Design an enzyme around this catalytic site. Structure first.
Site, PDB file in Angstrom:
ATOM      1  N   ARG B  55      24.194  35.199  58.194  1.00  0.00           N
ATOM      2  CA  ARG B  55      24.327  36.383  57.298  1.00  0.00           C
ATOM      3  C   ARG B  55      25.519  36.999  57.811  1.00  0.00           C
ATOM      4  O   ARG B  55      26.142  37.894  57.228  1.00  0.00           O
ATOM      5  CB  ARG B  55      23.190  37.252  57.231  1.00  0.00           C
ATOM      6  CG  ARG B  55      23.167  38.881  56.600  1.00  0.00           C
ATOM      7  CD  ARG B  55      22.032  39.254  55.703  1.00  0.00           C
ATOM      8  NE  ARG B  55      20.850  38.922  56.926  1.00  0.00           N
ATOM      9  CZ  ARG B  55      20.516  39.578  57.720  1.00  0.00           C
ATOM     10  NH1 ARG B  55      21.303  40.762  57.949  1.00  0.00           N
ATOM     11  NH2 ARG B  55      19.550  39.277  58.390  1.00  0.00           N
ATOM     12  N   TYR B 108      34.936  43.464  32.966  1.00  0.00           N
ATOM     13  CA  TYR B 108      34.057  42.713  32.759  1.00  0.00           C
ATOM     14  C   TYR B 108      32.646  43.159  32.453  1.00  0.00           C
ATOM     15  O   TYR B 108      32.117  44.095  33.159  1.00  0.00           O
ATOM     16  CB  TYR B 108      33.773  41.787  34.406  1.00  0.00           C
ATOM     17  CG  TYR B 108      32.814  40.736  33.947  1.00  0.00           C
ATOM     18  CD1 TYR B 108      32.469  39.822  33.005  1.00  0.00           C
ATOM     19  CD2 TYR B 108      31.598  40.467  35.171  1.00  0.00           C
ATOM     20  CE1 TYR B 108      31.669  38.868  32.799  1.00  0.00           C
ATOM     21  CE2 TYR B 108      30.930  39.705  34.934  1.00  0.00           C
ATOM     22  CZ  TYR B 108      30.689  38.756  34.137  1.00  0.00           C
ATOM     23  OH  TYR B 108      29.565  37.762  33.908  1.00  0.00           O
ATOM     24  N   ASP B 181      40.621  44.112  40.756  1.00  0.00           N
ATOM     25  CA  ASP B 181      39.593  42.899  40.577  1.00  0.00           C
ATOM     26  C   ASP B 181      40.769  41.996  40.147  1.00  0.00           C
ATOM     27  O   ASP B 181      41.189  41.943  39.095  1.00  0.00           O
ATOM     28  CB  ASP B 181      38.528  42.866  39.687  1.00  0.00           C
ATOM     29  CG  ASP B 181      37.753  41.690  39.627  1.00  0.00           C
ATOM     30  OD1 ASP B 181      38.428  40.709  39.588  1.00  0.00           O
ATOM     31  OD2 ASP B 181      36.644  41.790  39.095  1.00  0.00           O
ATOM     32  N   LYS B 206      35.953  31.672  39.776  1.00  0.00           N
ATOM     33  CA  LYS B 206      36.615  31.216  38.717  1.00  0.00           C
ATOM     34  C   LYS B 206      37.691  30.325  39.312  1.00  0.00           C
ATOM     35  O   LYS B 206      37.616  29.407  39.591  1.00  0.00           O
ATOM     36  CB  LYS B 206      37.383  32.533  38.068  1.00  0.00           C
ATOM     37  CG  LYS B 206      36.249  33.445  37.638  1.00  0.00           C
ATOM     38  CD  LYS B 206      34.930  32.839  37.063  1.00  0.00           C
ATOM     39  CE  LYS B 206      33.870  33.710  36.506  1.00  0.00           C
ATOM     40  NZ  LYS B 206      32.797  32.916  36.053  1.00  0.00           N
TER      41      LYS B 206
END
Ligand SMILES: */C(=N\[C@@H](C[C@@H](*)C)C(=O)O)c1c(COP(=O)(O)O)cnc(C)c1O
Ligand SMILES: */C(=N\[C@@H](C[C@@H](*)C)C(=O)O)c1c(COP(=O)(O)O)cnc(C)c1O
Ligand SMILES: *[C@@H](C)C[C@H](/N=C/c1c(COP(=O)(O)O)cnc(C)c1O)C(=O)O
Ligand SMILES: *[C@@H](C)C[C@H](/N=C/c1c(COP(=O)(O)O)cnc(C)c1O)C(=O)O
Lengths: 393, 394, 394, 393
Positions: B55, B108, B181, B206
Site C-alpha cells: 500500500r 469524463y 487529464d 486506456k
C-alpha cells in the site's frame, strides 16, 4: 442446515462457466461488449443485469464477493484494492460535511489517521473513545451521529469490545450504522452481524487471502447500502478497484481459510502459553487467556481465539529490538495473517504514524511486540523464541 | 540529448535485478522483511530508503512510475488502481472543506459526478466553466480557489483547450494548481507540464496499458506534492492500491506505446476523413482536421492527432443505435485506447450519469458517437463503417 | 535436527531478494542479461553460476525445486510443465534404443500408454509385471534392464508396493534405476529414497500445488542424473518448460501442503469407513484399513494414509454412473489432490486409454470408482454419498 | 477477401464469452467438470466435444491456437511450453526407430543436438546437409525417409533456403513431411505452407509473444496430423503443456505482432546499412541485401526482411567481446524477437553446444555476432553501435 464454513470457503457461490472449468477463469479485462446499444443503456441505467466495465463490476470479483457475503452472513460484499480502501469507500459514501462519527480510539494506525485528519478536513466530526467501557458510546452521541466504528480484537493491543452492547447504544437513536473491522478474526472466528453490526469490513490482505501476496479489502453488509458504496465510494470517490487477478488469488487463498485459521489459532495458544512463562517476558496479551480483560466477551464473540499475540518484555523497547533482530524463523515485517509467522514493533512501525500520546492513551506502549502466528511447527516456533529470549537472560 | 520517447517507453528508469532478469520480476508480495528493527523504524520515519508494505510502495510499481514520470517530464509519478483513483487521490489530498475548485464542464462522466456530487458534500466549492473560452478562468477565480482542472481533448467532444492560456490565468493568483487529464493524448502526444500544468493524471486503463485488460491510474508531478498524495491520498483516503501484477502488465503494454499511438493516429486520420464525407454524417470532431476549432492549438500541443474521433449522425439517436448495432469489426463497449477499435454512445453510456442539461451545455448531444481507433487494417475499418452507414441510409 | 516438514514447506530453501520481498517475485522473463561476454560464455560452459534462459533455468523455478528437493530428501529437483513431462524427461534421458524397462502394470493410464506404445517404437523393451509380488522383479531382470518403475499406492487401485523389497531386487544387478511416482502420497506422506529408490517423480498438478489450477511435474534425485535430465530431457527432448508464473503458484500452494494433507487424510479415513459399511458397496480400497493387503507395508512407508479412496459398487458400471451423476458436493472430473473433493470412473475416463484386458489384469474393473477427498466438512461429504447411495438402492 | 493479417492478429478466432468479456478470461484450471459420466466417457473416446484436462486441451490455449492457425493459413495449431517442445512433439510423434530424417545442417544449436544425439539414440537415422543447394535433398533420400526439416532464414547465419525446391524433392516420393521452423520470420513475413511445407513450427518465445517474458512453442499444420501430435507428442511423450496464463500473455503479445514486425524490420534495414559501412565491420549478413546469397529466394518468400542481422568485425572474436561489453542500449542476452534489441555471440553462447567443426561446416564462425533489432529509435540504436565500434578504431 446451512452449508458449513469449512465447506463454504470452497463451495459457496458456485459459478457456472460455459466450459465447466473446475476453477472459474480470470476475467482480466477492463471492459465488456454489449450485444446492442439498448442493452448497454439498460445496464448503465441499472435496468438490466450483466457487466459493463471493471471499475463497476467484474465476474471474477463477484465470485469472491458472494463467497465472502455468504461466510459473513450478509446480503452482499464489495471487494476493494486495499483494506483502507474498503474502510474509506464505506465511510466516505455514508458521510458528508456536518455528520459525526464515533470510533474506538485503539485502531490500526492508518485508520486512526484517516479518521483524525482526513474526515475532519471534510467537515466530519469525530470522537475517539474507549468503546469497551459500558455506556461510553451513548454518552458521546449527538443528533447528527451516523457511524460507530471499532475493531475487536483491536490492533495491536487485542482489546476486546462487547459488540452487542455497542450496537444497543448506537441503535438507541434512528439512522446510525455500526461498522466493525473484522480483519483480526476473519469470518471463521466471528460474524459481527450476529451481534447487531450493520457493516463488516476487512483487510483481505491478512487472513482471508492468507498468503502475503495480495493487498485488498472487503465490505460486507446489506445490498442497498453496498450498491451505494459501489456506485459512489468505489466508482467515484476512492477508485479502489481490485485487480481481477488479485481477486482470483484471494478466492484461491480463501479455500484453505478454515484449515488455516484453526492451525494458526492452535499454534498461537501454544506460543502464547510458552511466552507467558518465560522469565524475560513481562506481559502477554492473548484473547484466550482467562485473565485477558473481556475474556468472557471474547469467548462469546469468537469461535477460536485468533493467531495474534501481543507481548511486552521486562527489558522493554531495547529488549524488543534485540529479540526481534535475532529471531531466525519468525519473520520481521509488518502485516499479519499469512502462513508464515510475522512479528513487528507497533510504536516504531505500524502505529508510528499515531502520535505517542494518542498511542499510549489507547494502551499502545513502546514495549509492545505484535506477533501473527502462522502454520509452522509449534515446537520450532517456540524454539526460535527460546533462543532469542534466553539471550536477553 | 534526452532519450527519445520511442526508446524510453522500453528503456527509461532501468531496473537492476540481482539475476540480470531481462524483464524485471513481479513483486506480488504484500510486505517486505526488515534486516533489523532500526531499519524498519527508519523506513517508517522516512529516514532510510527501501520498502515496507505494498500500500506504501512496491518495486514493480516504482518501475512503472519512473518510466511514466520520465515520459511526462515530471519529477515523480504515483500509480493507482483506477484513473478515478488517480483523480480522487490527487484532488482529495489538495482540497479541504471550504476550498474552491474550477473545472471545465466537459469531462469524463464519472469525474464530473465526483466533482458535482462528492466534493460538494465535503464542503468544497465547484464551478463548471468553458475553460476553452478566453476570460472564463480568471473570472471565476476566488480567494479560496485551489485547483483549475480540465481535459484536452475533452471526453467526449474532443474540445481543445489552450493549456498555456489556462495556466497563465490560473497562475495569475498565488497557490492555484492546474491539473490536466492527459489520458486521451498519452505522454507520446502531449506533455502538459510543457505548458505550465502542475499535475498530470491518466486513466492508464486506456492507451498507456493499451490492451484493454487492466484498470489503473497515474498521477505525475512534483515530488513534494506527490509525496503528500502518496501518504494521504493513497495510503489513507482512497486506498487505491495498484496490484503489482497489473503494474507489470502496464509496463509490458507501455513498451509498445510509441508504435501503437503512431499506428492508431494514422488509422484515425483515415477513418475520420472517411466519416466526414459520408452523407449520413452531420459532423466529425477530430483534432487533425484543418478547419476545426483549436486546430493550431491542438497542433502546438499534440505531436500526433490521436485516435479518438467523435461524430454525429444526421439521423440522431435512432440512427446512432442502428449504426452501432450493425458494426461487425468495431467493438461496442465503453473504454478506449486499446489495440482493437471501440465505439459507444456517450449520452446513454459513459455520460448517462450527467444530467441531460449539463450534457447538452457541454455539447454532448444524443446523436453523438465516440470512437477509439485501434491498429486493425484502415481499409477494413472504413469498410465496416461503409456497410453500417449505407444500411442506415438504404 | 532437520527442519520439520511442517515448517519446511514454507521455509526450506529460503531466497534472498534484494528488496527483502516476503514473497519472492515472479521471474516471468525468458532471458537473462550478461554483465559481459566472458560471463555469458562461462555460464554456457558450466563454469560460472547465474542464469541464461528460462528453458535452461529460472530463479522462481529454482526456488520451488530446492523446496521440493528438501522435502523429498534428494540432492536436486527439476520442475516440468506436466507430470507426464517429468516422467518422460526422466525415462527419455536414461534409456536408449535397445534398453529394457520393467514397470508395475498398474499405473496411471497415460504413463502406461507412454511405456507400452511410445517407448517401444523407439526400440526400448518393456515388461509390465506385478511388482507387489515377491520374485516378479528379479525374474524379469535382463542384462539391458535400466529401470524398474512403479507407483504406490497405485493409480487407481491403491495397490501397495513394498519399495524396500523392489529396490533390493532391482539393485541386486548393477546399473538399474528404481523410479517411484510419489504423486498420491506427496513428500508429506512418503520419501521413497528412504527405501532405496533412486528417482522420485510427481504430477505437481495434484496435492503439491493442491488448488486444481496448475499442470506441472517434478523430478527429484541425485544432482548428477538430474543435471543430465535437465540438459537432455528438458532442454532438447521434451521441452517441458514450466512457466515461472505456475512455479510461483505451486510454491504458494506448497505452503499449505502439510495442513491440507493432514486435513484430507483425516477426512478420507472417515469417508472410507462410511463407504465400507454401506450396503451398496462391494469393496473399499483405502491404505488405512487394518484388514487390507499391504497395510503394514503402507504403515511403514506412509506417515498418513492419504486422501485417495477407491471403491467398487455391487451394482457395477450402471450403478457407478447413477451414483456419480447424483452427487451434489463431490465434483465429477478427473485429476485429484485439490482442496475440493473429486471423483471419476477409471475404466471409462483416466484409464480408458488402456486396453480393457490390461485394465482387468491390473484389477481395474468397470464397477470401480476413484475418489480424491478434499477439505470440506466430513459430515457433509458423507451425507452427499448417503443421498447418492441410498437412491441407488431405493 | 480474407481478413488481413493486421486485423487478424487481434480478431481472428473470435471467442464467445458468456459475460461478453472484451478480452477472453484466463482458464487457469487443471480440470473441467463433466455434466454426467456419459459426457465424460464420450469426451475421453473422442466422440464428444468439450474439455477434459489441461494437458489435453484448454479454452485459453485453443484461443491462441486458432489465431495462429489462421495467420499461418493451416487447419490447426498445437501450442506447447517451448519451441523445443513444439519441435520434439512433432518429430517424436511422426518418427519411430528405423525411420530417416533429413535436416539442414545450419540450425538453432539445441535443435541440432536433439537431432544429432536424441533421435539417433532412439534408432532414427539423420542426415545433416545444406538444403539450400539445388537437388541436395533428393540425393540423400532413402525409402524410409519421413521428414525433411529446415530453418530459413537459418539461426544464426541467416542462410536462405528455397522452400518450394525442397518440397518438390521431398514430395517426389510418397509419405514425406516437410517441416519448416518459421521462428525468424513469424507469420507476418512468411507462410511456409504457400511453398508446399506440411508442418510449420515456431518458438513463440520470440516474435509472436514479442515481450521476452514467455517461453513457448507452436505447431501449425493439418488437423489429423496435429490431433496425433496432441494425443501422442503432447499427452505422453513430451508433456510440454503450456500454462494457460502464458498462452493468454502470448495472445496479448500477438495483438501487436503486425505493427511490431514492420517497425523491427524497418529499424533492422537502417541498422544493417549503418553496420555495413562502418570501417571496423568486415561483413554484414541481412536477407534484404542484394548481395545476400539467395536474396531473390528471400524476396520471393518474405514480405519484409526481418529484424535479425548477423555480422563479423575485422577484429574477430576479441573485437566482438569488446563491442558487446560496451554497448549501452542494445542488451547482451540470448533469445530474440522482443521489443528491446538483443545481441549475443553464437559460438560461445547459443551454438556453443554444437562442436566447432560442425559449427564452421555450417558457416557459423567464431567472429559472428547475432543481433535482433527491437523498436527503439533507429538513430539511438545506430549511435550505440557508433560509440561501441569507434572504440575498436
Ligand atoms: C492492515 N494493517 C497492517 C498494515 C499496515 C502497516 C498491519 O497492521 O501490519 C490493516 C488494514 C488496512 O488494510 P490494508 O489497506 O493494509 O489492506 C485495515 N484494518 C486492519 C485491522 C489492519 O490491520
Ligand atoms: C529459440 N532459440 C534461442 C534460445 C536458445 C538459446 C535463441 O537462439 O537465442 C529457438 C528455438 C527453441 O525455442 P525455445 O525452446 O527456446 O522456445 C527453436 N527454433 C528457433 C529458431 C530458435 O531460435
Ligand atoms: C468509464 C466508462 C470509462 C472511460 N473513461 C475513463 C476515464 C477516467 C477514469 O479512468 P478509470 O476508468 O477509473 O481507469 C478518467 N479520465 C478519463 C478521461 C477517462 O476517460 C470511458 O470509456 O470514457
Ligand atoms: C490424467 C487424466 C490426470 C491424472 N493423473 C495424472 C498423473 C500423472 C500425470 O501428471 P500430469 O497430468 O501430466 O500433471 C502422472 N502420475 C500420476 C500418478 C498421475 O496420476 C488423473 O486424474 O489420474
Amino acid at each position: 442446515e446451512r452449508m458449513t464454513p469449512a465447506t463454504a470457503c470452497i463451495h459457496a457461490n458456485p459459478q457456472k462457466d460455459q466450459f465447466g472449468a473446475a476453477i472459474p477463469p480470470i476475467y482480466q479485462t477492463s471492459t465488456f461488449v454489449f450485444d446492442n446499444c439498448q442493452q448497454g443503456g439498460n445496464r448503465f441505467a441499472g435496468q438490466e443485469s450483466g457487466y459493463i466495465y471493471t471499475r463497476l463490476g467484474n465476474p471474477t470479483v463477484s465470485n469472491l464477493e458472494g463467497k465472502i457475503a455468504f461466510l459473513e452472513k450478509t446480503e452482499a460484499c464489495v471487494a476493494t484494492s486495499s483494506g483502507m480502501g474498503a474502510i474509506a469507500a464505506t465511510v466516505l459514501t455514508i458521510l458528508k460535511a456536518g455528520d459525526h462519527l464515533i470510533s474506538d480510539e485503539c485502531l490500526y494506525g492508518c485508520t486512526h489517521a484517516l479518521f483524525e485528519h482526513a474526515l475532519t478536513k471534510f467537515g466530519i466530526q469525530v470522537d475517539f473513545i474507549n468503546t469497551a467501557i459500558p455506556g461510553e458510546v451513548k454518552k458521546h452521541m449527538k443528533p447528527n451521529t451516523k457511524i460507530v466504528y471499532f475493531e475487536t480484537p483491536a490492533n495491536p493491543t487485542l482489546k476486546i469490545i462487547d459488540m452487542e452492547r455497542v450496537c444497543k447504544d448506537a441503535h438507541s437513536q434512528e439512522g446510525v450504522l455500526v461498522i466493525a473491522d473484522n480483519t483480526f478474526c476473519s469470518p471463521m472466528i466471528t460474524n459481527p452481524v450476529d451481534f447487531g453490526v450493520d457493516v463488516v469490513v476487512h483487510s483481505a490482505t491478512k487472513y482471508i487471502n492468507g498468503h502475503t501476496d495480495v493487498v485488498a479489502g472487503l465490505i460486507c453488509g446489506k445490498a442497498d447500502l453496498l450498491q451505494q458504496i459501489r456506485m459512489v465510494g468505489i466508482k467515484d470517490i476512492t477508485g479502489s478497484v481490485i485487480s481481477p487477478h488479485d481477486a482470483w488469488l484471494i478466492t484461491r487463498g480463501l479455500s484453505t481459510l478454515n484449515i488455516r485459521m484453526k492451525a494458526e489459532s492452535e499454534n498461537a495458544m501454544k506460543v502464547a502459553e510458552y511466552l507467558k512463562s518465560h522469565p524475560a517476558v513481562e506481559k502477554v496479551y492473548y484473547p484466550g487467556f482467562e485473565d485477558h480483560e473481556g475474556h468472557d466477551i471474547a469467548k462469546k464473540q469468537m469461535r477460536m481465539y485468533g493467531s495474534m499475540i501481543t507481548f511486552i518484555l521486562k527489558s522493554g523497547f531495547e529488549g524488543a529490538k534485540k529479540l526481534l533482530d535475532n529471531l531466525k524463523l519468525i519473520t520481521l515485517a509488518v502485516s499479519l495473517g499469512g502462513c508464515e509467522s510475522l512479528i513487528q514493533h507497533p510504536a516504531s512501525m505500524t502505529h508510528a504514524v499515531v502520535p505517542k500520546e494518542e498511542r499510549e492513551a489507547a494502551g499502545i506502549t513502546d514495549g509492545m511486540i505484535r506477533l501473527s502466528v502462522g502454520i509452522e511447527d509449534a515446537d520450532e516456533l517456540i524454539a526460535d523464541f527460546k533462543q532469542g529470549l534466553d539471550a536477553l537472560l
